[PDB]
Structure 1
Amino acid sequence: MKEQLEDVLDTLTDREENVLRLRFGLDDGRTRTLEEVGKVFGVTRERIRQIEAKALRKLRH
Structure 2
Amino acid sequence: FGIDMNTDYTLEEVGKQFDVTRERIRQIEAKALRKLRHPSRSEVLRSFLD
Which band: TM-score by shorter chain?
0.5 to 0.7
Q: Which runs of 4+ in 1 moved over 4 A?
A: none
Q: Which has the higher contact order (CA 8 A, sep 6+)?
A: 1
Larger radius of gyration: 2
1:6-38 CA-to-partner distances (Å, cap 9, x unmatched) read xxxxxxxxxxxxxxxxxx121113211111101
Query: Relative to total residues, which structure has the larger helix share, 1 or 2?
Result: 1
Structure 1: runs of 5+ lacking an equivalent: 1-23
TM-score, length basis structure 2: 0.62
